[PDB]
Every structure is written in structure tokens, then in C-alpha cells.
């Protein structure tokens, strides 16, 4: 059913005309055992794909967000629950209405997040998607594919998961690895897709010379890497940086990714 | 052990749980240690990968609020982001959704969208106004060992009226800080099993199994009583199995009580209650 799903939110706002991109945020884990209370996990905290969700949905996009169970939730991931729980005072006793009240000091953006969330729910222009191991990771990411590919040019991939190498088809563990689990995978489900793919490695010599090699066997178009921020292409390769003017107004790196994304977007498309 | 490197503020850590504990045990209060998540061990310098044994802490956070909900102080040592107390039963989605908006902020929604909503704020509120509610993270092994070990020697003075209420999923193997595809993964020290009772000898201990595998739980329960000298072992099987040297018990969850907004949890607490009433 999530098939179904996400082709609808997809093609809804591809009438509209809107460009919709995938987020994928957090790690995958793989089971050791067939129970499995064990898990091989790549950890990722999902900030980064969350606050990116967050600056492509102010940006206009629509956002399909696939992302690791319990990792960082777009919006809510400013306020963890002890904040919330101890900041929000029921105001007073209500018609059918729970009233509260809170030190705005306390919950710093509080409302404004509470806005931009329901302004995206009401214009339907985010649909979130869970997943825990590779397994669910590796179904959902086709049934979004998939769900993609008619948008062809305006539709964007963010694949920023940190998803598994290796899994398993005195504690004693081998493994099988799989060198596509290294590509995107995307592009035989959307290939006309802006394709944008995260690499761990930080020397930059390193980095251009494994994207660039990328890039030319699965045809992707951009890797990104924290080196800052370097943004590779074929026959191009960009280091972003915050300024401290930015930093101290409270300015995150991943506004600034999603904007040079979005610009180079709209010349692919 | 010395052979996990320490969390950090280990020391702080101590001292605020010897401090909160002293402050209630003083009050005749009884406290109960909550251990509740997994916990994870790395397997390479600089990890990003990590071996992890799962448990969302639902139960563990739930029985928290149970344990509260009776009067007890808690000490909530439990896995960063897995279920937290109150909070777990109202996810991001839900609250994003259905809050909506002088220095002071103001917010309405419908009760119908957050139901008992209302009622987990205060009693959040009411334990933290209290000094009823201490609550300690950790992620790895490491972190799990050292911060136990701390609350199990903050807990110590008060004696039979400290509980320790083991809900966590512990990591059965792991890397040495020194030993460290195919990986390959040591015990964890038989050494470090017992470290609860050895700082406090005369608390009223509980371990909770996390499986629900009858015949798997019936078992891995008779044994953490003979060996591991636990006064009770407590598991979900639907019912909950409650077990002792000299007892087995099963509860059920009624119809009306599945009704009425009752969950196992409460009625686990409510005949621990009495055990350690006895026990004391």
C-alpha cells in the first residue's frame, strides 16, 4: 500500500507542477539471527536529513521522507521530550479543547515549527515513511523510486541514510558485502531523476576522485561529502561555508546545501 | 570495570544519584532503579557501526510511569532516544499535529487528539516539582556498566527499600578497548553479572525478561533466581509471568480492565508493590 500511497502524493504535486524530492535520513540495520534481538547498526542521528527536509519543504518542494524509526524527526528533533514535557503547563481546565501555555524562552521556535509542519500537512506536500532494517530500507526505497519516476527531471533524490554494506543471508559473525549497496540505488527505478548521493570519506582528494569514477558508472549526478561542505560533480566541485554572521543568527548548513541543490536542480531540469 | 572507558561526568553522575536518593530515602520514600532500552558495543575505533541489542524501552518507560503513578522515586537509567517516560505515548507526528498556536506562549488542541495528554504533563510535573523523577542516559556498554554501577551504590543505604527494576536488553558479547567480513566477539565478563547485588546487597531485585517466548522466558527465569540470587523475574508471555524461589504467578489483563484504559504495566507494579512491602 505504501506503493500506492506515495505514487499519489507523487503525482498530485507533479500536477501541480511542484518538484518533489526523497529524503532518506538515518542508518539501516541488519539482523545477525533469525529471531534477531541482535542488530548490526549504522548509526546516523537523521539530523542532517531532517533539518534538510526542513529547508527543501521551505523552499517550495514537496518532501517524501524516508527515514530510520526513532532517528531525527523533522521539526520535533529541536524539542526532545524532556523539553516539551517539562516546558508545556496545561494553561486551565475546555470545549472539547486542551489549553496550554509555555515560556517562549523555553521552546525557542516552537510555534514556528508547529506552523510549517501543519502548513505542509494541509497542502499535503509531505508524506513520511519509516523503516528499520536494509531490508525495509531497500523496499521502500523502490516503492519511492518508483513512485518518482513519472516527475522524471523535476523529481530529486537526497540519499542521505547511511545504508548497509554487508549483511548476513565467543559470538561468531560473517558476512556477505554487496558492492551496489554502495550505489544509488535509484536510478534503474527513476532514471531521469536529479540524483544526489552522501559519501562518509573526508579528504577531499579522496572524495572527487571516488565521486567523479562514481558518477561515471551509475550516472548519478551529485555526491556530497563534510570535508565543510563539498558539493562534486562531474565537472565541478563546490566547498561550501557558514559564516559566522550566519552561525551566530542561527543559520544551518544543510539551508545553504538544499539552496546550491535546488539552483543546480532547476538547470538539470 | 576499568576496561570500559567511563561515560561522561561518570563522577556528577554518582554524586546527583547518591543525592537523590539519600533526599527520599530520607522521606521514607522507596526508590526504585529502572533500567529500561539496549544497549550497543562498537567493534572498531572511531565506530560508526555498532553491535546493538534492541529494545524500544516501551515497557521499561512505562513502568516508570506505573512506578511513580504508586508513590515510588524513579531512577530512569535508560538508552538515549529509545521510549521515554509520558513522552512515548504522544510521538512526533502526534504533537506537531494536533498543537497549535507576550513572552508566554499559548496553545490549544483538540483532547481528542492527544488523549491524556493533559494528565501526563502534570504528573511529569508533579515528579520533577517533587524530586521524584531522575532520570540517566547511556548508549553503549560502557556507559550502561559505569552508570549501574553508580546507582547501584547510590541505592545501597536505603537498603530493602530500594528496588532495581531490570528492564534493558544487555549486550551479551563485545570488542575489547585492547582487541580491536568476519568479526569475532568476546563474552562479556561473568564478572560484571552480579555487580548489582554486590553494591547492594539488600535491595528487593527484579530482573524483567524482554522475550515472550513461553518456554524460552520459563527457563532463562528459573535460572536468574538460582544463579543470579534475584528475588523475582518478571515476563510478558497474553499474560505476565511473575516468578520467585517459592512462586509462580500469572496475571492477566481483564476485559473491563483492557476497557477501562488499564495496562499490564500498572498491574505488574501494583503486585511488586506488595512483594516489597513484604520484602521490607
Given at each position: 500500500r505504501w506503493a500506492e500511497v506515495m505514487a499519489r502524493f507523487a503525482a498530485r504535486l507533479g500536477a501541480q507542477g511542484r518538484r518533489v524530492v526523497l529524503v532518506t535520513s538515518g542508518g539501516t540495520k541488519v539482523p545477525l539471527?533469525?529471531?534477531?534481538?541482535?542488530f548490526l547498526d549504522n548509526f546516523s542521528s537523521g539530523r542532517r536529513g531532517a533539518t534538510s527536509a526542513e529547508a527543501f519543504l521551505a523552499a517550495g518542494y514537496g518532501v517524501l521522507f524516508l527515514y530510520r524509526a526513532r532517528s531525527a524527526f523533522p521539526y520535533?528533533?529541536?524539542?526532545p521530550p524532556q523539553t516539551w514535557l517539562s516546558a508545556l503547563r496545561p494553561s486551565g481546565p475546555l470545549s472539547g479543547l486542551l489549553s496550554l501555555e509555555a515560556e517562549e524562552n523555553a521552546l525557542p521556535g516552537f510555534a514556528e515549527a508547529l506552523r510549517s509542519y501543519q502548513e505542509a500537512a494541509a497542502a499535503g506536500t509531505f508524506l513520511v515513511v519509516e523503516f528499520t532494517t536494509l531490508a525495509d530500507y531497500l523496499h521502500l526505497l523502490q516503492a519511492a523510486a518508483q513512485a518518482l519516476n513519472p516527475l522524471g527531471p523535476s523529481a530529486m533524490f537526497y540519499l542521505a541514510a547511511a545504508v548497509s554494506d554487508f549483511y548476513v543471508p565467543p559470538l561468531q559473525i560473517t558476512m556477505k558485502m554487496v558492492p551496489?549497496?554502495?550505489?544509488?540505488?535509484?536510478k534503474d527505478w527513476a532514471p531521469k531523476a536529479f540524483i544526489i548521493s552522501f559519501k562518509l570519506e573526508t579528504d577531499p582528494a579522496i572524495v572527487i576522485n571516488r565521486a567523479r569514477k562514481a558518477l561515471e558508472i551509475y550516472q548519478h549526478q551529485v555526491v556530497v561529502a563534510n570535508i565543510f561542505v563539498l558539493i562534486v560533480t562531474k565537472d565541478s566541485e563546490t566547498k561550501l561555508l557558514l559564516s559566522e554572521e550566519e552561525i551566530e543568527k542561527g543559520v544551518e548548513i544543510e539551508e545553504k546545501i538544499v539552496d546550491n541543490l535546488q539552483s543546480r536542480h532547476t538547470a538539470f531540469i
Open positions: 539471527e533469525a529471531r534477531p534481538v541482535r520535533a528533533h529541536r524539542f551496489k549497496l554502495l550505489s544509488p540505488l535509484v
